[PDB]
Amino acid sequence: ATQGVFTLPANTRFGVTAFANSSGTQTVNVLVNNETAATFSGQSTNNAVIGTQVLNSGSSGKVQVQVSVNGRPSDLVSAQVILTNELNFALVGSEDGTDNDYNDAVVVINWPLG
Amino acid sequence: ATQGVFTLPANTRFGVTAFANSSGTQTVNVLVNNETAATFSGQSTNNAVIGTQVLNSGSSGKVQVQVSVNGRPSDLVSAQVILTNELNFALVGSEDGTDNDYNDAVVVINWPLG
Amino acid sequence: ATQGVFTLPANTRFGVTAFANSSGTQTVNVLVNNETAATFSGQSTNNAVIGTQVLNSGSSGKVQVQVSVNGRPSDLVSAQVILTNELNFALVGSEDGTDNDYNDAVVVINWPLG
Amino acid sequence: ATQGVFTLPANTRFGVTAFANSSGTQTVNVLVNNETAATFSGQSTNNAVIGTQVLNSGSSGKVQVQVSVNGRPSDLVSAQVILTNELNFALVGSEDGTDNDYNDAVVVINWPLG
Ligand SMILES: OC[C@H]1O[C@@H](O)[C@@H](O)[C@@H](O)[C@@H]1O
Ligand SMILES: OC[C@H]1O[C@@H](O)[C@@H](O)[C@@H](O)[C@@H]1O
Ligand SMILES: OC[C@H]1O[C@@H](O)[C@@H](O)[C@@H](O)[C@@H]1O
Ligand SMILES: OC[C@H]1O[C@@H](O)[C@@H](O)[C@@H](O)[C@@H]1O
Ligand SMILES: [Ca+2]
Ligand SMILES: [Ca+2]
Ligand SMILES: [Ca+2]
Ligand SMILES: [Ca+2]
Ligand SMILES: [Ca+2]
Ligand SMILES: [Ca+2]
Ligand SMILES: [Ca+2]
Ligand SMILES: [Ca+2]
16 A cells, blocks of 8 residues: 555645664655655664654645655655644654664654644 | 544544443443434443444534443543555543553544445 | 554453455454464445454464455555553554555454453 | 553663644653653744654663643643554654644654664
């Protein structure tokens, strides 16, 4: 099944943050309405934040997270969780190799903000 | 925080099912747009299904689950999880006593159907 | 990534219930420690419960859900959610065709029981 | 029900990161085995990261997140989500006022690392 794709309420600000846990340099691309809206690049094996930014879901509300290492797409796992019918978390994990820890690039999207 | 309240897409069919794990008789009430739409009553300490039904979220999409034992409201815990940005689960747990297993009445709402 | 596999606490009773939403007959197989422990078969396009049963996670705690239609494995989506650090839900969705509603066979595993 | 408490596997490294979305200064305290292990303090209404750190769950695996503003405990909401039976997210939201957006202090715990 497709992973890393989330439908957020339209024209809503959200945060996107990425953590790295791999020897390979992680390239995280965030698309809004199928167009790049943010790109984070970094390397860490200690969960360092390689990027964080505030974006707007726009008219479509479509947000997609892509993760690649040296141009090769990583395998993604994702899900959305809503707490008290208000607080949203769009979660993404990714695997660039064979150990399957799926934490090589961890992306967290949260809303609402403010 | 409020628990057991979920905003579903409008006019969408969904399933609601309740399981019981308590000495006390569980009364599960499901409200749609603040009006009763289903009521399940049963007793089991072996996770028996005390009720299952198909409902429609209506114009408001507001769905609220209430659980009580002998007229006394149980304490609720809940959350919504979305898989592959399509499959939805609105989950509710409830505690009628002091052991805090929160499974006395377990309610699962799922959509889409068909 | 692998889906439908969950590690439950050892020797713990859990419930497993399956719902069907497809023209095709759904075959849900539940494995505990890689050995069949339950099999549900049914057909419904109205979220009917095609099976529910209480199982024990055993010494390994490994539980895997398989879904197939006419012998063909469906594509699975899954996740585990824990509420108040006590109530557990192991969720599985499955797609047997091309519309991607992933509800053809919906499986819910819950614990603790009693 | 109690919120903000999570049982992680013993002696496992995990990351904890906090975001702020409130006029009030957020004080996030992380306890491991009931003893303070990290404290973040900051103010932002734009989801700024007020802290991030790597901790070890220790022998007990008990991790608890506390959030307060000017010494007053905020109301918490939380849940744990596991993807592909490997990637873990312990999520916490908090409300310091009356608008109930529960994002005043957002805390994300993730593991495994490396
Ligand atoms: O080479 C990539 C590899 O780097 C290691 O340090 C680990 O983080 C692995 O999970 C990852 O797949
Ligand atoms: O008396 C109510 C009580 O019944 C027991 O059998 C357990 O199921 C408890 O969790 C529940 O609170
Ligand atoms: O033929 C299989 C097909 O049956 C339909 O009724 C729908 O439930 C589809 O989602 C499913 O894939
Ligand atoms: O004064 C506290 C208050 O600050 C505002 O800016 C919002 O972030 C509210 O959600 C928050 O409760
Ligand atoms: Ca890896
Ligand atoms: Ca890794
Ligand atoms: Ca109880
Ligand atoms: Ca009980
Ligand atoms: Ca289908
Ligand atoms: Ca279907
Ligand atoms: Ca607030
Ligand atoms: Ca706020």
